[PDB]
Amino acid sequence: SSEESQAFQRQLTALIGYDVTDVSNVHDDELEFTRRGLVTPRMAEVASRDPKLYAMHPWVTSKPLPEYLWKKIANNCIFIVIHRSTTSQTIKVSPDDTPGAILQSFFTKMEQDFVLRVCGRDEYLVGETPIKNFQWVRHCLKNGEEIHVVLDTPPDPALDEVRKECDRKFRVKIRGIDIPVLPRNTDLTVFVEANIQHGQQVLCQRRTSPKPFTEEVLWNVWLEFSIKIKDLPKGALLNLQIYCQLLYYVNLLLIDHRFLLRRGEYVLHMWQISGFNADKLTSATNPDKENSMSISILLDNRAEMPNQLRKQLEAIIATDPLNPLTAEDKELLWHFRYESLKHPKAYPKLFSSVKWGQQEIVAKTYQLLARREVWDQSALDVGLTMQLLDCNFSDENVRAIAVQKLESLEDDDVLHYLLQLVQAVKFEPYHDSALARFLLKRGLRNKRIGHFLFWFLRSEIAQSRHYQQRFAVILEAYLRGCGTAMLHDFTQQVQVIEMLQKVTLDIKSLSAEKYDVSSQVISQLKQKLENLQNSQLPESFRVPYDPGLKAGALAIEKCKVMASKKKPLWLEFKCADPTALSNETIGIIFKHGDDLRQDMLILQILRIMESIWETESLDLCLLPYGCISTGDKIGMIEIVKDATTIAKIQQSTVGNTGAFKDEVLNHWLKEKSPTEEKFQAAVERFVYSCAGYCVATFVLGIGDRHNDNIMITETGNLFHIDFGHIERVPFVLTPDFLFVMGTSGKKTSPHFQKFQDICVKAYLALRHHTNLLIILFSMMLMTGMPQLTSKEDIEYIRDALTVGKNEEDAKKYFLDQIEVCRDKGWTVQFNWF
Numbered sequence: 001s002s003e004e005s006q007a008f009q010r011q012l013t014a015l016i017g018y019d020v021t022d023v024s025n026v027h028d029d030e031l032e033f034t035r036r037g038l039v040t041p042r043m044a045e046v047a048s049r050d051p052k053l054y055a056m057h058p059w060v061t062s063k064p065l066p067e068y069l070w071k072k073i074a075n076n077c078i079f080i081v082i083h084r085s086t087t088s089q090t091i092k093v094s095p096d097d098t099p100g101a102i103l104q105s106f107f108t109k110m111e112q113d114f115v116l117r118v119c120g121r122d123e124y125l126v127g128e129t130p131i132k133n134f135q136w137v138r139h140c141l142k143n144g145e146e147i148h149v150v151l152d153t154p155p156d157p158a159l160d161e162v163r164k165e166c167d168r169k170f171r172v173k174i175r176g177i178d179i180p181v182l183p184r185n186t187d188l189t190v191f192v193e194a195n196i197q198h199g200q201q202v203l204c205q206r207r208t209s210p211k212p213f214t215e216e217v218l219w220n221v222w223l224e225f226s227i228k229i230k231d232l233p234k235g236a237l238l239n240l241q242i243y244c245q246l247l248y249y250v251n252l253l254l255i256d257h258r259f260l261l262r263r264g265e266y267v268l269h270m271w272q273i274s275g276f277n278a279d280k281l282t283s284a285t286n287p288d289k290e291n292s293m294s295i296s297i298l299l300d301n302r303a304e305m306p307n308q309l310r311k312q313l314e315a316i317i318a319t320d321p322l323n324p325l326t327a328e329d330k331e332l333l334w335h336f337r338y339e340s341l342k343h344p345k346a347y348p349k350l351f352s353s354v355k356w357g358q359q360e361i362v363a364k365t366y367q368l369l370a371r372r373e374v375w376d377q378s379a380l381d382v383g384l385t386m387q388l389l390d391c392n393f394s395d396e397n398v399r400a401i402a403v404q405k406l407e408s409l410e411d412d413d414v415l416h417y418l419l420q421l422v423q424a425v426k427f428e429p430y431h432d433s434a435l436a437r438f439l440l441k442r443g444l445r446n447k448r449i450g451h452f453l454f455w456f457l458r459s460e461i462a463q464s465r466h467y468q469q470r471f472a473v474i475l476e477a478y479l480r481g482c483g484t485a486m487l488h489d490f491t492q493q494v495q496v497i498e499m500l501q502k503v504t505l506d507i508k509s510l511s512a513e514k515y516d517v518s519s520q521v522i523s524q525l526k527q528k529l530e531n532l533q534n535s536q537l538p539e540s541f542r543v544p545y546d547p548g549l550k551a552g553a554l555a556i557e558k559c560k561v562m563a564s565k566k567k568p569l570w571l572e573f574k575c576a577d578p579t580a581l582s583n584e585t586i587g588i589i590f591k592h593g594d595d596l597r598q599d600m601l602i603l604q605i606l607r608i609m610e611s612i613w614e615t616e617s618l619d620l621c622l623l624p625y626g627c628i629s630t631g632d633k634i635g636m637i638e639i640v641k642d643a644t645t646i647a648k649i650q651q652s653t654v655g656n657t658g659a660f661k662d663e664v665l666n667h668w669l670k671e672k673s674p675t676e677e678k679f680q681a682a683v684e685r686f687v688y689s690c691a692g693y694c695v696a697t698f699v700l701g702i703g704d705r706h707n708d709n710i711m712i713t714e715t716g717n718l719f720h721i722d723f724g725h726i727e728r729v730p731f732v733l734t735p736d737f738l739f740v741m742g743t744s745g746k747k748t749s750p751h752f753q754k755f756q757d758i759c760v761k762a763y764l765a766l767r768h769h770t771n772l773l774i775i776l777f778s779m780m781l782m783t784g785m786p787q788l789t790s791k792e793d794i795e796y797i798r799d800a801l802t803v804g805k806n807e808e809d810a811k812k813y814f815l816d817q818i819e820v821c822r823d824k825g826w827t828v829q830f831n832w833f
């Protein structure tokens with residue numbers, strides 16, 4: 001242990017926002033044992049990285065260029081503009097031309113130590129991929145934009161260097177609970193519920209004699225369980241709960257990370273309920289020992305299948321993931337488990353029908369995971385895989401076969417699911433896990449993933465007492481192998497970020513619920529930023545939410561506090577890249593108040609929906625604006641250029657409490673549209689945007705929004721914001737939207753025909769992916785929400801997706817929705833006062 005070694009680990013602590021060397025809140029080896037464990041994988045991957053692709057992080061895809069998109073090409077001709085000092089020149093290019101082929105089609109057109117960086121960004125067009133298959137190139141086409149690139153020497157790989165390094169029954173004694181203070185009522189009653197638990201499947205359950213709720217309550221009882229030790233499954237949780245009604249909980253893994261039976265004396269500080277979720281599963285103990293409830297415990301311990309059964313079975317397998325299997329359903333799946341293995345789709349339900357509390361049966365389960373041959377051959381199906389990592393499955397080998405499948409994902413896809421897989425670590429019974437390692441693999445393999453992984457992790461470590469230890473050990477594994485380049489970038493980012501959390505907090509306090517932003521408050525802000533620039537704040541930091549963009553110095557004059565309840569900052573920066581084609585500013589918001597994580601989740605689903613729509617050549621021009629959480633109820637938000645609220649547009653001359661008129665929206669588009677044809681573009685863009693956000697929100701159950709939370713770009717692109725948050729209407733199709741389509745109050749139109757038609761395809765498109773959507777929603781709710789319901793709240797989505805139903809009744813159901821919204825018109829909007 002050098003110094004060196006410490007100062008490093010010190011900077012590491014500073015990045016993570018947690019100290020993984022601290023052993024104050026542990027009762028065993030596991031975290032430390034996971035740190036040592038993760039080294040081998042980290043290394044393996046570090047020592048395997050192609051150093052120059054690593055350094056240049058090409059952002060590519062194996063996916064076919066969508067149709068829409070194809071019809072935006074001259075004649076197998078794509079234009080590119082290169083630059084060298086204050087020089088330029090275009091090259092015609094064909095979609096399949098490699099970069100190398102291009103670069104050489106230039107040295108011919110009149111050394112190899114030169115490469116194609118995109119202008120303004122830290123992004124590269126290198127490696128063996130068709131230009132069509134780079135994402136920037138795809139982003140350029142979508143947005144009607146010209147592709148601009150600089151020529152310069154490759155960044156040095158050496159910059160990215162890493163630094164070296166029994167048959168008896170189970171019982172538990174319940175000695176007693178203790179708590180420094182009570183006053184919440186006066187004397188009620190309370191017992192302890194000991195639960196043996198696997199995939200949230202309760203295996204066995206005992207309670208204690210009631211007693212009255214004194215600051216201390218001893219028992220002091222042995223509690224015997226049905227189950228025998230030998231039949232305890234790896235991953236079993238002793239789950240201890242205190243009822244009056246449910247008030248505190250805490251879990252103890254019964255089998256440890258060396259497969260030993262947990263044996264001895266414990267004092268487990270519990271977690272409290274704040275009135276079915278991932279926080280309830282945790283092995284973590286409450287780190288706040290001053291105030292927490294405390295519990296105390298001692299551990300001393302061939303042939304075929306008849307027509308209609310096959311059909312009963314297949315009926316069951318066909319079912320959705322929320323369709324509950326009866327004991328019949330289960331006995332059937334198990335008994336015919338060999339038939340079952342022939343369908344990858346039957347797996348969740350099959351392994352949900354394993355009696356894990358029986359060792360002989362567990363044994364048999366492994367026996368048939370030995371015969372993996374159909375699973376292995378099957379085409380990856382992220383929904384199906386993802387199901388094998390929720391709270392229902394808590395066996396190492398099951399979850400491993402899932403992860404096995406994710407290995408075949410290319411980078412492109414990993415990013416789409418990165419946040420949910422990170423969150424899936426909540427359901428892991430152990431700190432080291434296939435899933436953990438896979439994230440760590442992939443993050444270390446590709447810079448882009450490695451960046452979003454860093455913040456996704458840090459996001460939780462900063463504000464999940466229940467999991468911050470675990471995720472911290474993992475964040476460390478990453479940072480220990482990601483390269484000094486990136487430590488530097490991160491360290492800077494964190495520093496910028498922390499600075500701005502202070503400024504944002506100091507300011508919020510300096511403002512009460514008077515809805516006005518007084519100049520001596522804007523005096524304070526304007527100043528504070530100067531007093532930081534100046535200090536302290538570095539020459540340039542990399543934009544999380546979009547790590548292609550570097551930001552440098554503030555544009556103070558353009559910065560402002562926002563005249564909303566939360567008083568968020570609205571910060572604009574210059575772009576530290578001297579090469580970009582514009583002067584448009586880099587705009588970031590900061591915000592204390594709401595839990596930003598919920599927002600990240602809805603956005604990432606929104607991207608999963610967009611990509612689905614690509615697989616059927618649909619483009620609904622969502623804007624999932626960038627949004628990274630950073631700390632307790634605080635994070636950051638992308639500023640979407642040339643955009644206003646819809647509320648803001650209604651407060652025209654048509655002002656505050658007296659509103660709203662149907663046209664208005666329309667003039668604003670024309671007012672802001674240079675030519676009647678660009679205006680024309682906008683109504684297209686709008687018809688689409690509207691389609692997207694209508695189906696999306698409906699499905700996600702966030703349909704019904706006041707329009708101060710709905711926005712639109714000058715160019716016609718509408719978009720919800722502030723998912724916050726948390727007489728109805730299924731969505732915000734208000735008469736002002738409808739005219740512009742040209743139809744109010746209840747007629748019809750070319751565009752409202754178009755609109756209707758587009759939704760119908762979109763809804764249906766999503767329905768072709770019911771299961772994936774169901775698992776994500778379900779996962780979204782358990783890993784990121786306040787009050788939920790292991791049935792009802794999650795079952796919302798099966799309904800909104802109209803599971804059951806032929807293609808027809810679905811389409812019908814949706815146009816009703818539309819008609820509901822019209823009935824109706826301005827009712828709800830008005831109702832918000």
Ligand SMILES: CC(C)c1ccc(-c2nccnc2N2CCN(S(=O)(=O)c3cccc(-c4cnc(N)nc4)c3)CC2)cc1
Pocket residue numbers: 562563564568589591625637638639640641642643644645647648708709721722
């Ligand atoms: C930016 C201006 C046009 C604005 C001002 C106030 C409001 C607003 N009005 C009523 C109620 N709430 C409001 N919010 C302002 C701040 N936001 S936010 O910071 O959490 C947020 C969330 C999502 C998107 C945005 C955003 C991004 N880019 C731009 N250009 N504008 C807004 C801002 C919450 C909602 C919306 C937009």
